[PDB]
Write a protein that binds this ligand. Sequence first.
Ligand SMILES: *C(=O)/C=C/NCC(=O)CCO
Ligand SMILES: *C(=O)/C=C/NCC(=O)CCO
Lengths: 260, 260
Amino acid sequence: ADVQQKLAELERQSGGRLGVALINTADNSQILYRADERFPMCSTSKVMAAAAVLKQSETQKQLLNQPVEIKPADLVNYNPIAEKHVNGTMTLAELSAAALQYTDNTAMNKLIAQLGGPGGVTAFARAIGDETFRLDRTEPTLNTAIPGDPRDTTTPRAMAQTLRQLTLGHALGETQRAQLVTWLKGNTTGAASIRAGLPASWVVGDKTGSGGYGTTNDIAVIWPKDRAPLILVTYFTQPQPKAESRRDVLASAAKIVTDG
Amino acid sequence: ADVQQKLAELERQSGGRLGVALINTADNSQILYRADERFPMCSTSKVMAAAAVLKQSETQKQLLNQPVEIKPADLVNYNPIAEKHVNGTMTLAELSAAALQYTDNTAMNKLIAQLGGPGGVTAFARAIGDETFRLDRTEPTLNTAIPGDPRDTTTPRAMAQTLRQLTLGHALGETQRAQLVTWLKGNTTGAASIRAGLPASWVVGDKTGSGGYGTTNDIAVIWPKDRAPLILVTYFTQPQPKAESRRDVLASAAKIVTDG
Ligand SMILES: *C(=O)/C=C/NCC(=O)CCO
Ligand SMILES: *C(=O)/C=C/NCC(=O)CCO
């Protein structure tokens, strides 16, 4: 079962462009497909923002408890948690969990503002060795996902390497690494994406993304039953602005790269 | 009408037996398909067990914080949370969250044992006016899903009415209703099931289930964009003992009954 042929056969029937990077931590092996091409991150960028706030919390003792005001003018296009707290507050822990687990776009804008704007998220990426990631705009326009636009993009290779360092390596302090893994494992939005291509016994923490041009993304840490963890990035984007999501493509890509 | 044609077409093309009950709380209207037939509940029974322990906590006010020993011998077939706490303890709140949001089977068995066995779960159903629900076994045998077997079954109509009373009505005290809704909204397993058939802006709390005979279930409380909440039960089972899961059939059924 040649994995490269199978990923090409999936892509050719998909109506889009597929990017895959798998890191198997049992042996540091990698499976790469368009892994050095740039894809729009969409909501998968929320992992870098939440991680940068966790890094801040290593030096600002009570940071995750700090209340942040939510005003009516802050609401954007998808605010399932933040709309409950308008003319009130959410803590930076609650905004981190809302952004990662509920993909709340207002919550992500508060994380970006806590970092000094999109460039502060990029700066944290650079501080942990990621030279590829770039965040350029706030929610919701960071999800436009226009083909060819470098704004708000990374590569599968870079994002897999970064996600390994954040969740399994030492980019964060041990308490903060554990909190990041707890949050990803509590994701509510992932079951139809990478997880749908894996056996029922395997444990996943992930962050999805979706945006214009049918962009459909997932980045995951995987704890397979009786195996060392995997990191898997699956990015997908389509040529028409109003294309439909294709989470099924991501599930198929995950099955192909884990079957062996 | 068209909804009945679409559900019968989904069912026929799937090869299985589909049960649907939708309650629209805007006007108490319903959409029903095989809504009085019995289906194996599988892990959707965890909602009744967690609700029964919430009910106990209305009078045993410290019960959710009670430590429960997790022994190696207590682990069954899918225990993603309990395996991290073997030779230690989890509280009944932690076990309720694990059962509901991670579908942990070891956690469900501790809820059942807290209630004095499967009959305690049934007794709570009867106390809140559900005369249909029955729990007969523990995990994992409650998931055998043998055709014709009435054990560990309910009807879509009965489960939709119960889930309405638990999440939107007064089967529970207000704090316990809110706690059940917070748990369901934090489900990690549901994005391929009812949630996949609904517009992205709608808010869902749900509990999935899976078992023998390709049994694939979901029960959900839904807060549609700008509308009164819905309750939706989708139950699905297949003729072959080893049939694969079909979460796409539940997503298809949800789209059909909410499109109009
Ligand atoms: C992540 O890519 C974006 C997450 N939230 C926005 C939506 O879910 C838009 C649905 O219309
Ligand atoms: C609910 O129906 C069952 C939950 N636990 C079993 C699994 O979902 C995974 C089996 O490996």
